[PDB]
Design a binder for this molecule. Sequence first.
Ligand SMILES: *[C@@H]1O[C@H](CO)[C@@H](O)[C@H](O)[C@H]1O
Ligand SMILES: *[C@@H]1O[C@@H](C)[C@@H](O)[C@@H](O)[C@@H]1O
Ligand SMILES: NC(=[NH2+])c1ccc(N)cc1
Ligand SMILES: [Ca+2]
Ligand SMILES: [Ca+2]
Ligand SMILES: [Ca+2]
Ligand SMILES: [Ca+2]
Ligand SMILES: [Ca+2]
Ligand SMILES: [Ca+2]
Ligand SMILES: [Cl-]
Ligand SMILES: [Cl-]
Ligand SMILES: [Cl-]
Ligand SMILES: [Mg+2]
Ligand SMILES: [Mg+2]
Ligand SMILES: [Mg+2]
Ligand code: NA
Ligand SMILES: [Zn+2]
Ligand SMILES: [Zn+2]
Lengths: 191, 254, 142
Amino acid sequence: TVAAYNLTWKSTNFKTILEWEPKPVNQVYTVQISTKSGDWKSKCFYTTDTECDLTDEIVKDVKQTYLARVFSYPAGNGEPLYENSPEFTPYLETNLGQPTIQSFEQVGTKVNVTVEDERTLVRRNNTFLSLRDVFGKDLIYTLYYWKTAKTNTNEFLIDVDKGENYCFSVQAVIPSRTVNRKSTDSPVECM
Amino acid sequence: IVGGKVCPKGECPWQVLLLVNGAQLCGGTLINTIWVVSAAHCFDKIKNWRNLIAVLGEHDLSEHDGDEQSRRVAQVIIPSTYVPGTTNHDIALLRLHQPVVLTDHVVPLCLPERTFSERTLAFVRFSLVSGWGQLLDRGATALELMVLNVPRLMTQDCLQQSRKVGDSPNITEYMFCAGYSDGSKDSCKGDSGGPHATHYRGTWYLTGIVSWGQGCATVGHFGVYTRVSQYIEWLQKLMRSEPRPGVLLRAPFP
Amino acid sequence: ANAFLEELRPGSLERECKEEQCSFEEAREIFKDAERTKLFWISYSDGDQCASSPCQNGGSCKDQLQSYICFCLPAFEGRNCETHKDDQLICVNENGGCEQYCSDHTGTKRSCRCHEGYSLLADGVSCTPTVEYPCGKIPILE
Ligand SMILES: *[C@@H]1O[C@H](CO)[C@@H](O)[C@H](O)[C@H]1O
Ligand SMILES: *[C@@H]1O[C@@H](C)[C@@H](O)[C@@H](O)[C@@H]1O
Ligand SMILES: NC(=[NH2+])c1ccc(N)cc1
Ligand SMILES: [Ca+2]
Ligand SMILES: [Ca+2]
Ligand SMILES: [Ca+2]
Ligand SMILES: [Ca+2]
Ligand SMILES: [Ca+2]
Ligand SMILES: [Ca+2]
Ligand SMILES: [Cl-]
Ligand SMILES: [Cl-]
Ligand SMILES: [Cl-]
Ligand SMILES: [Mg+2]
Ligand SMILES: [Mg+2]
Ligand SMILES: [Mg+2]
Ligand code: NA
Ligand SMILES: [Zn+2]
Ligand SMILES: [Zn+2]
């Protein structure tokens, strides 16, 4: 066996996949995940994949700090060769997904712009929670229009000029973050 | 035990106090009414083999009470591969002359099946280690049974997190590290042979034996325990064996 | 794209890009500003990565830039909901749900066993003591 390397966390709206190298040659992998004081949970048993979906483990508590390790096992079946992953705190590191402008309505002399609820992989009491459900006040949405507006909800109420048709685009933002603070811009929508 | 707590009376029911000539020798773990698992190195300096006593139900060494049961050690079985003065294959299986009586204060720890131990118990983060050993590296030993919760490490991590020391023993497949590298908690010399017990789904199992370490609660070091899972077959086979005239028996391993 | 008689009208995002597929320059001619045209184009020409219906077993796809997210039904997981949680009952997966011992049986279901002093319960996974003082239990507490 050869130990996995370049273990990387790919996470968006809590969909969290651990990826690694290299492609297996006469060896299979098994992944383990845990929190600093918790027990190790096994996932992706004897897989030939070089990735492992850990979404279901991390969504149990998105604010926890998880560490994973990829075990290498020789083909056919004593501590195995393994590599530890970087630590990963979902709440602080999951990328914000690309938003979608749900609608825009000219209410009076202003335009209301509504951002579609971004659904995440966290599924409270049967349903998938939105980004706002998860982040609350930590999440704001920003609007680039033609110039910039910001909201604590999923709606913007901006002043427009009579009959001028504006164009808009929005981003999900977690202001408290130092890194990975925003999503990619939503597709542009014009009146 | 450095940095632990007193194990409340009756809460470490499988802990054994081994005495030689009436004096404190080592800890041990009751696994059934007749057998006790301890560490091989505990018998490195023994000359009076007929003077070994196993005490069950012990708690406070300064007081005797009606819960204590003493039995003569009839046999001490060590792997013939073990070398006195060294660390590898640090395990001993002792046959008591007469069985202890199981009570609320004397209960055996479950010796687990090997695979269950390797694939399941080995991944339970915390386990308890206990004994009447030193309360501080080179300090006085404890009068009341002490217990400590320690996290287990895979050997690769142990090596990577342990301070480089010239002459240090190899951490083999017959051992595992558990503890803290921060100088705050750890088992110690006098705890040798005591249990490293793992709680899983409501039942406690024997996963390790207090074996060695660089000092006790030394910065950059973890406690090293005998990996009991490597000896399951060896222990079971031997427990079905018939007594021999001499006390000490060096049995082939595997 | 062009077809002469339809090209007599002034520029229109709806006509040229929303109803028809436009080129970067057509779009640029509409937005004029580079940045404007850039953010529009970035998503417009990105493509719907969910078009290929990558999410299996009843999962739902949500498009992103050059990628997608699969939301799975409860009994599935994996990037594409390809993993059946129901086909994972093996001993390495949380002891196969067994309280004490677990035995794998390829082709058939795994079974659970107990340590001496315990017998397997009705449920086929839990263990109950058959003696007053089974190993591994602390009586003064329980
Ligand atoms: C279409 O679906 C396949 C898998 O079903 C995926 O690999 C592609 O990325 C997606 O666009
Ligand atoms: C996409 O999401 C999954 C979870 C189910 O609700 C599907 O019916 C839906 O289309
Ligand atoms: N855990 C330890 N530091 C240790 C255990 C046994 C021993 N004899 C010496 C040190
Ligand atoms: Ca006493
Ligand atoms: Ca046309
Ligand atoms: Ca056209
Ligand atoms: Ca044009
Ligand atoms: Ca043109
Ligand atoms: Ca896309
Ligand atoms: Cl949202
Ligand atoms: Cl006796
Ligand atoms: Cl020491
Ligand atoms: Mg149109
Ligand atoms: Mg055109
Ligand atoms: Mg042009
Ligand atoms: Na230490
Ligand atoms: Zn007692
Ligand atoms: Zn006594």
